[PDB]
Each structure stands twice: as structure tokens, then as C-alpha cells.
């Protein structure tokens, strides 16, 4: 998987703006927006392309659908139900989602908004690839080490993907994109 194209598409908040054209569609949530864009960003070779759903489309295949982060600590009760109303419509409506990228770092245990995601992500049995960023910053030899961590933490359904990824040495993104691929053409 070669990116040789890719262009943010919309900024939806309901059904009515999502995209047409029945192109497989791939959701990615994170605890913070900020390394959400970063993960994206190398996934397609560039560092800027990445409340709303952003889509963005690949390669003309695909897309990309950006879920705003899910940190809520400092989200109001409000915004929070505005969020779930929007991620909930298009988990249940959306016929062309095949699966949800779910981003952690590799560093230090996941948080219990990452846990309760992941859960909520397989109540409704979609499979998840979860990844794992930041590996550049963690010697080989703990690498183990820390998957354990972040797969014991999440509890990881057997049938999900733990992906060890850098956005720096661009480690882990031929297998995302072949766990992308894999959910794709299902």
C-alpha cells in the first residue's frame, strides 16, 4: 500500500453530510486529537492533512474517518452527550465502517477512558486494530514488555490486532495498513 493520494473530504456532524460512493470506511479514535492527526498524518506520508467526523479520502479506496478524541475530563456533561449522540449514530448507521483504529501510547498504561472505549467498541462487535504509538521511545528489549501492559490493560479480544507503531521510524505502518487492508476486503 502505496499512498498516492489523499484529501480531506468533509466535516460531518449527521448523516445527511457523510460522503457517498460506498468506499469502505476506516474510524480512528484516540484519547487526544493531537496524536490522533499525528498517526494519520503517517499513514499517508504527509505531516499536515489531518465536534465533527472528519473524513478524509485514500488512494480513492477508502476512507478515513477522524472520531474527535475522547479525553473528557474537562468535556461538560453536554458535549459529551453531543458526542455520543454523533459517534453512536455513525457506528449504528454506517454501513461502510469495517473497523475502528483505537490509538494508545506504548509508554505507560492506558487510561480508563481508553479501557471504556474499547469496551464500548466491542459491545457492538466491531473489530478494532489497536495501536500502540511512541515505540521509538521505549529500548527493544521492553518492547514485550509494554505490549503486555497496554493488551492487559484494554483486555484485547483474541480476534483484534495489538500493533506496535512509531510515527517516527514509521515502524508498524506496513501492518496497519495490511490489518486496514485485511478489515477492508472482508
Given amino acids: 500500500m502505496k499512498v498516492t493520494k489523499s ?11 457523510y460522503p457517498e460512493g460506498g468506499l469502505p470506511e476506516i474510524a480512528l479514535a484516540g ?5 490522533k492527526s499525528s498517526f494519520i498524518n503517517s499513514l ?22 477522524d472520531v474527535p478524541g475522547y479525553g473528557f475530563a474537562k468535556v461538560s456533561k453536554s458535549e459529551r452527550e453531543a458526542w ?4 453512536e449514530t455513525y457506528i449504528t448507521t454506517r454501513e461502510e465502517l469495517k473497523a475502528v483504529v483505537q490509538i494508545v501510547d506504548l509508554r505507560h498504561a492506558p487510561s480508563n477512558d481508553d479501557v471504556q472505549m474499547y469496551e464500548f467498541l466491542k459491545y457492538y462487535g466491531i ?11 521505549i529500548p527493544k528489549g521492553k518492547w514485550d514488555k509494554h505490549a503486555k501492559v497496554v493488551r492487559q490493560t ?10 506496535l507503531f512509531s510515527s517516527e521510524t514509521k515502524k508498524g505502518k506496513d501492518e496497519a495498513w495490511g490489518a486496514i487492508k485485511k478489515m477492508i476486503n472482508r
Wanted: hydrophobic share 45%.
Fill in 44 to 65: 499517508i506520508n504527509r505531516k499536515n492533512l489531518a465536534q465533527t467526523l472528519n473524513f478524509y479520502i485514500i488512494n480513492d479506496e477508502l476512507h478515513f474517518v
Fill in 7 to 17: 484529501e480531506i473530504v468533509i466535516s460531518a456532524v449527521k448523516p445527511e453530510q
Fill in 127 to 137: 473489530p478494532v486494530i489497536v495501536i500502540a504509538t511512541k515505540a521509538d521511545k
Fill in 31 to 35: 484519547r487526544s486529537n493531537v496524536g
Fill in 154 to 163: 484494554l483486555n484485547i479480544d483474541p480476534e483484534d490486532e495489538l500493533i
Fill in 84 to 87: 455520543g449522540r454523533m459517534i
